[PDB]
Write a protein that binds this ligand. Structure first.
Ligand SMILES: Nc1ncnc2c1ncn2[C@@H]1O[C@H](COP(=O)(O)OP(=O)(O)O)[C@@H](O)[C@H]1O
Ligand SMILES: Nc1ncnc2c1ncn2[C@@H]1O[C@H](COP(=O)(O)OP(=O)(O)O)[C@@H](O)[C@H]1O
Ligand SMILES: Nc1ncnc2c1ncn2[C@@H]1O[C@H](COP(=O)(O)OP(=O)(O)O)[C@@H](O)[C@H]1O
Ligand SMILES: [Mg+2]
Ligand SMILES: [Mg+2]
Ligand SMILES: [Mg+2]
Lengths: 505, 505, 505
C-alpha cells in the first residue's frame, strides 16, 4: 500500500467521515451540557496514627449519627418526566425548588423487592399540596402535620412554582449510609502527619457542606468522649462532568470509528475500479462511459452530454475495430443484467445513424426487452412472431422517431426463447438485413444468466461485452469471456460503463 | 530516496519555508514582548516536623486572615480595551496607575453565575471620578465615603493620568483564597531541616512582597498562640515569560511545520517532472518548451525568446522526423485543455514560415478555437462553413499579418462538430491543400475530452501530443496514446511544454 | 564507499581544512589568553547537623551583614573601551589600579529600568580627579568629602597612573547580595561530619579572601549569640579559564566542522570526474585536455604546453577516427557555453596546420564569436555577410598570422542566425571549400542553448562534443547527444576539457 491511496480514500469518503464525526460530537456536547453538575466540598482536620481514624470516620456509627441528625433518609427529588428535563430546566435558567421535611413516615409495604416506599407531591400553591402514593389522593397544608391512611408527613417552607412535582422516598437507613459512604473520602495527604482531608461530592453545593460539617462535628464530639482546622467549603466549579475531555474523547472516537468503517469498506470492495484491471487480464477496453446525471434516447434528448461524447469515442474506435470482420453485425452483451447493454446499444445506434449510415437495431432480449417502449412502438409483430413463423421479414421493422435508424422489437414474450433463437429463420433474417443496411446492432440478455447471447454470437461478426463500473468484477468478466469462447464466439473486447470520478484513482 | 533530492526540494521551496518560519518567529516575539511579566518573591523561615506545617501554611485560616488584613478581595485592574493594550503601554514606558481602596461594598446581585459584582471607575482628575456599574452613572470624590444606590466606596490616593479607567471587582472570599493559594508554594529544600522556603508569584513586585510578609507574620503569630530568617524580597528579574526559550520554541516549531508541509506537498505530486518519465514508457519527447514570461504571436513579437529557440529546436527535429511520412500534414493534439496546443502549433507555423516554406494552419478546434483572434480575422467563412457546404475552398483561407503563413479559422461554432469533421469534404480540403503548400499544421481539441482529434488523425501523416509540464501526468499521456492507437492513429511522440527550472532535478 | 576515496578527498581539500582549523584554534587561543582569570578562595569551619547551616550561611542576613561591613555595594571597574582592552593590559604587564571608596551616594534616578546609578571618574593626578555622571562635570580632591549636585563621594588612596578612568556604580543591596550568593558555595565533604568547606570565586585574589573571612566571622558571631579551622586563603592558580581544555575543544571543533563541510561538498558534486563516467554511458572520450595555466593561440605562443601535447594526442586520434567519413568537415560543439569549443577548435586547427595540411577554420557562432579577435582581423565580410548574400566566397577568407591556416569570421551579428544558417549558400560554401582544403573545422554555439549546431551538423562528416571537466554533468552530455541524434546528426564522441589533478582519483 502507499500513502496516496489512503489519502484518496479519505477524500472520497469525506461526507461519511464528516457526518459520523459530527453526530458523535453532537452527542458528546449534549451529554456534557445536560449531565447534572457534581460539586465537591472539602474539610481539613488535625490528628493530635491516622491509619485507624480513616476507618473510624467511615464506620456506620459516625455516618449513622450524621444521617439521623440531618434526616438524610428522606429523599426529595424534583420531578421531570424525560431524561433531559433537568438539564433543560437548568440551561433555561429555571431555579430549582425545595421542601424542608422534618418528619416522614410511609406505610412501609416492605415486600420482597420494593423496600423503599415513595409518594408524589404536587404543589398547588405556596400553602397546600396534593399527595398520591398508589392512586390514593390526599390534600395537605404546610404547617399542620398529616396523619392519614397510614401516612405521616410534616412539610415546611415549600419553595417552587405551583404545578411542580416532587418524589418523596423513605429509603432504608442502611441505603442512606451506603449512599453517603460512596461519595465520602478520607485521605492523609502526608502519610505521616495528623492532617486528614475529608472530601464529599454531591449535586447540592450547600447540602454537602452541611453534611460534611455534621460529619466533622460528630467525629470531634465522639473523640473527646482532634482539631477542626478547615471547616468544609464547596468548590463552586463542578468536578464532573469535565466538558472539554468529554468533547475531545467524543471527537476522537468519531474519527476512529469513521476510519475503521472506511478501511472496512475499502477492504471489502471487489468491483472494477479502472480499465487497467481489465487490461491486466488481456481484455481490450474500447471505451469508458460516464454516468449521465441528466423513455427517451440520451443521444437525442441531450446530444451534447458527456456520455454521448464517450459513445462517439466508442463509435470512432469501432469504425477501426470492425474492419476485416466477416459481416457488419455487432452484438452487445454483458455479464449481469442492468449493466448498460440496451443503453449502450441504442445510443450507439443513434450516434452512428446521425452520420448518414443506415442502421438496424434488433432487440434479441426476448425475455425482458423494453426497446419498443423507448422508441415508440406498435408492439405487434416483433422478433418472436417472426421466429415462430407468424410474421414476415418486412412487417417487423419500424422506425425510431427522434432517431434515424430502424429497429425490430422483441414482440410477445415466448415460452421458449432460447429454442426460438436457434431456428434458421434468425440467420435468414440477419443475412437479408446484411444487404439493406450498413450496420446491424443486436441487444442480448446477459450470458451468466442465460445462453441466448451465445446462440446469437455465432452469426455476429463483432461481439463486445459491457461491464458496469462498480457492480461487476474482473472474475465475472473473465468467466463471461471464457463462456463465450467455449461456445465458439470470439469477444473483441469490453466496454466499461457507469464510470464516476474518484480521488483515489 | 537520496540526500540530493531532499536538499533540492528544500532549495525549491525556500520561499515558503522562510515565510512560515518568519511568521512563527514574529508571533513568538510578539508574545514574548507583550506577555505580562511575573515576578517572584521569596522568604525563609525556620522550624524549631515541617511535614504538617506545609499544610498549615496553605490552610484557609492563614490565607483568609491574610486576605482580610490586606483587603485582597477588592480586585483593581487597569482598563485597556485590546488584548495587547497593557503590553504596548508597558513598552512605551507608560507608568501604570493605582488606587488605594479601603472599603468596597457592591449591591451583590448574586445570580446563578455572576457571583462577582464589578464597577468601572473613570478618573476625571486627581480628586473626583465617575462610577458606572450597569449604566448607572455616579460621581465620587476622594476622601469622603460614598453610600449611594446600594454601593459603598472609599477611594484614597488615586495615581493615574485623567481619563484612565479601572475595573473594580468584589470577588468572593473563597475565590480570593483560591487565587492566593494557586500562586503560593512551600518547600523544605532539605527534606529534614527546619528551613522552609515560601515562594509567591505575582505581577506586582511590591504587593507580592507585602502579601508574603503578611502570610509569614500571621503564621508566626498563630504558632506562638518558628523563626523568620529571611523576610520576603522580590527578584527584580521576572520568572515568566522566559523570552529566549519561547523564541527558540517558535523558530523550531516553524521549521518543523514547514518541513512537514514541504514533505506533504512533495509526496502528493503526480505531474510530469522530466522528459525521462515519459521516455521510460517509450514516448519520444521531441522538445521541451520553457515558460515565456514575456493576442499576438510570440515568434513574432519577441523572435529571440527562449521558448522560440526551443521551438526552432523542435522545427529542426521535425524536419528529420517528418521524412518518409505519407503526406505533409502534421497534427498537434494533447490530453487536457490548456496544455499548449495552439501556442505550439501557431508558433511552430511561424518559425517554419520564416524559413521560406509555404505553411497552412488549420484551426480544427470547432468548439473553443480562438486562432482567428490571434491572427487578425474576418470571422466569416471558417472551417465550419466549408464543412457544412456553405463555402468554397478559397474563401476560407486568410493570411497572418506579422506571420508569413496562411490560416483557416474555425468559423461559427456548429452544433455537431464531430459529425462535421467526418464529412469527406474535410479529406478533399486536405488533399487539395497538400499540393499548394509545403506544410499543413492542424490544431485540435484534446483527446481525453472529445474525439475530434482521432477523426482528424486518420488523414494526418504525423501526429504529436503536447504534455503540460506540471499539470498532466504520465498516466494521462499513456491513456491518450493508447486511445489514439485504438482508433488507428500512430502518435509519433510527445512535446513537453511550460517547463521551469527546478533545483531538485 | 571505500577508505581510499575518503582519504583522497581529505588530501584534496587540505587547504580548506587547515585554514578552518587554524582560524578556530586562533580564536580559542585568543579567548584563553584574553579571558579574565578567576581565582578561588577556600575556608574550613567545624560544626560542633550541617544541613540547616548551609541554608543559614547563604541566607540574606549573613550576606547582607557582610556587604554592609565591606561596602560591596560600591562597584568600581577599571575602564577599557574595547572587549579585549583588559586582557591586553594584563598581558602587557600593566598593573591595575584601585580606589578605596568609603562613602558613595548618587542621586538615585530610579526610573523603570536603570536602578543602578553610575558615574565615571577620570584620574588627573595622585590627588584630584574629575567626575561625570550625565555630562555634568565636577572636580574632586582626595581627602575632603564631596557633597555637590545631589552626589556624595569620599575617595581615599587612588592607585593608578594619571589619565585612567573608573566606572563607579551604586548597585542595589539585593543585587549585591545576589552577586555574592552566585559565586559562594558551601559543602560538607563528608555528608556527616561537622566540617564545612566554604568556597568563593572572584577576579580579585585579595578581595575574595577578605570577603570570605568576613562571611566566616559574621556567621561565627551570629552563632554564639562553630569553629574556624582554616581561615580563607586564595589559590594563586586561577580556576578559570582552563586554557588547555579550551584549546583542545577549539581544535576538535575546527576539525569536525571542516570534515562536515568537506563531506557536504563531496556529496553535492554532480560534474564529470573522470572519462570513465562518460564511457559508462557509451560515449567515446577521444582526449582529456588539462588546464593551461600559461588574444593569442596557445599552440603558437607556447607550442610545448601540456595542453598542446594533449591536443596533438587528439590530432593523431582524429586522423584515425576521421577515416571513412563522408567528407573532410569536422564540427566541434558542446553542451554549455564556455566549455572550450573555440579553444579546442582553434588550437586543433593550429596543430593540424603545422603538419603541412591546408586547414580552414569557420566561426559559425554567429551570436558570440570572437575568433577574429584572436586571429587578427578585418571584421568586414564574415560568414553573416556571405550567408545574407552581400559577399562572395573569396572575400571572407583571411589568414592567421602566427597560425598557418585560413579562417572565416562570423561577421556582423545578424538578427536571424538560425535562419541564415539554413540557407543553401552555406552548403555551397562547404562543398566549395571541401575541394581546396584538407580539413575544415567549424566552431558552433552550444546545443542546449540554441539549435545552430544541429543545422550545421547535417553537412559535417564528423561531430565531436566538448565537455568541461567539473562544470558539465553526464546528464547534460547525454541530453546533448540525444538531441543531436534526434535531428539526424551522429556524434562521434566527446572531448573532456579543463582537467586537473585530483588525489581522489
Ligand atoms: N452510463 C449510464 N448513464 C445513465 N443511465 C444509464 C447508464 N447506463 C445504463 N443506464 C440506465 O440505467 C438502466 C439500466 O441499464 P439497461 O441497459 O437498460 O439494462 P441491461 O444492461 O440489463 O440491458 C437503464 O434505465 C439505463 O437507461
Ligand atoms: N510555454 C508557454 N509560455 C507562455 N505561454 C504559454 C505557453 N504555453 C501555453 N501558453 C499560453 O497559455 C494559454 C493556454 O494555452 P493554449 O495553447 O491556448 O490552450 P490549448 O492547449 O487548450 O489549445 C494560452 O494563452 C498560451 O498563449
Ligand atoms: N584547457 C583550457 N586551458 C586553458 N584555457 C582554456 C581551456 N579551455 C578553455 N579555455 C579558455 O577559457 C575561455 C572559455 O573557453 P571558450 O572555448 O572560449 O568558450 P566556448 O566553449 O563557449 O566556445 C576561453 O578564454 C579559453 O581560452
Ligand atoms: Mg437489456
Ligand atoms: Mg486550443
Ligand atoms: Mg565559442
Amino acid at each position: 500500500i502507499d500513502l496516496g491511496r489512503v489519502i484518496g480514500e479519505l477524500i472520497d469518503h469525506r461526507k461519511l467521515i464528516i457526518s459520523i464525526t459530527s453526530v458523535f460530537t453532537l452527542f458528546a456536547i449534549l451529554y456534557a451540557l445536560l449531565a447534572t453538575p457534581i460539586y465537591e466540598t472539602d474539610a481539613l482536620i488535625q490528628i493530635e496514627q491516622s491509619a485507624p481514624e480513616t476507618a473510624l470516620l467511615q464506620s456506620r456509627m459516625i455516618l449513622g449519627k450524621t444521617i439521623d441528625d440531618l434526616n438524610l433518609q428522606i429523599q426529595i427529588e424534583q420531578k421531570y418526566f424525560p431524561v433531559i428535563g433537568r438539564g433543560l430546566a437548568r440551561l433555561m435558567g429555571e431555579k430549582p425548588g425545595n421542601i424542608d421535611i422534618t418528619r416522614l413516615y410511609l406505610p412501609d409495604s416492605d415486600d420482597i423487592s420494593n423496600n423503599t416506599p415513595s409518594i408524589i407531591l404536587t404543589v398547588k400553591d405556596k400553602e397546600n399540596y396534593s399527595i398520591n402514593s398508589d392512586g390514593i389522593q390526599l390534600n395537605g397544608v404546610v404547617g399542620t402535620l398529616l396523619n392519614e391512611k397510614g401516612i405521616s408527613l410534616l412539610v415546611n417552607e415549600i419553595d417552587a412554582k405551583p404545578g411542580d412535582q416532587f418524589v418523596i422516598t423513605q429509603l432504608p437507613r442502611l441505603k442512606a449510609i451506603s449512599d453517603l459512604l460512596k461519595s465520602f473520602s478520607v485521605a492523609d495527604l502526608g502519610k505521616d502527619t495528623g492532617m486528614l482531608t475529608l472530601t464529599l461530592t454531591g449535586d447540592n453545593p450547600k447540602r454537602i457542606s452541611h453534611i460534611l460539617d455534621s460529619i466533622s462535628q460528630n467525629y470531634l464530639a465522639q473523640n473527646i468522649a482532634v482539631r477542626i482546622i478547615d471547616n468544609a467549603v464547596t468548590d463552586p466549579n463542578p468536578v464532573r462532568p469535565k466538558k472539554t475531555i468529554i468533547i475531545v474523547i467524543g471527537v476522537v472516537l468519531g474519527l476512529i470509528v469513521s476510519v475503521v468503517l472506511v478501511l472496512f469498506q475499502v477492504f471489502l470492495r471487489r468491483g472494477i475500479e479502472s480499465p487497467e484491471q481489465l487490461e491486466e487480464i488481456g481484455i481490450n477496453v474500447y471505451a469508458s462511459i460516464p454516468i449521465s446525471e441528466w423513455d427517451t434516447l440520451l443521444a437525442v434528448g441531450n446530444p451534447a452530454d458527456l456520455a454521448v461524447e464517450a459513445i462517439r469515442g466508442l463509435r470512432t474506435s469501432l469504425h477501426f475495430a470492425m474492419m476485416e470482420a466477416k459481416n457488419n453485425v455487432l452484438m452487445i452483451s454483458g455479464a449481469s443484467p442492468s449493466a448498460g447493454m440496451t443503453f449502450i446499444s441504442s445510443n450507439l445506434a443513434a450516434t452512428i445513424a446521425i452520420t448518414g449510415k443506415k442502421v438496424l437495431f434488433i432487440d434479441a432480449d426476448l425475455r425482458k426487452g423494453y426497446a419498443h417502449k423507448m422508441f415508440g412502438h406498435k408492439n405487434d409483430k416483433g422478433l418472436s412472431e417472426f421466429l415462430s413463423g407468424q410474421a414476415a421479414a418486412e412487417m417487423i421493422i419500424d422506425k425510431v422517431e427522434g432517431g434515424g435508424f430502424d429497429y425490430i422489437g422483441r414482440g410477445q414474450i415466448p415460452p421458449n426463447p432460447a429454442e426460438l433463437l436457434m431456428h434458421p429463420r434468425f440467420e435468414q433474417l440477419l443475412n437479408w438485413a446484411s444487404q439493406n443496411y450498413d450496420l446491424i446492432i443486436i441487444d442480448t440478455p446477459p450470458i451468466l444468466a442465460v445462453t441466448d447471447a451465445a446462440i446469437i454470437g455465432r452469426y455476429a461478426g463483432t461481439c463486445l461485452l459491457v461491464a458496469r463500473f462498480e457492480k461487476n468484477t474482473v472474475k465475472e468478466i473473465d468467466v463471461s469471456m471464457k463462456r463465450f469462447e467455449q461456445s465458439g464466439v470470439v469477444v473483441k473486447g469490453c466496454i466499461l460503463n457507469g464510470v464516476v470520478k474518484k480521488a483515489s484513482s
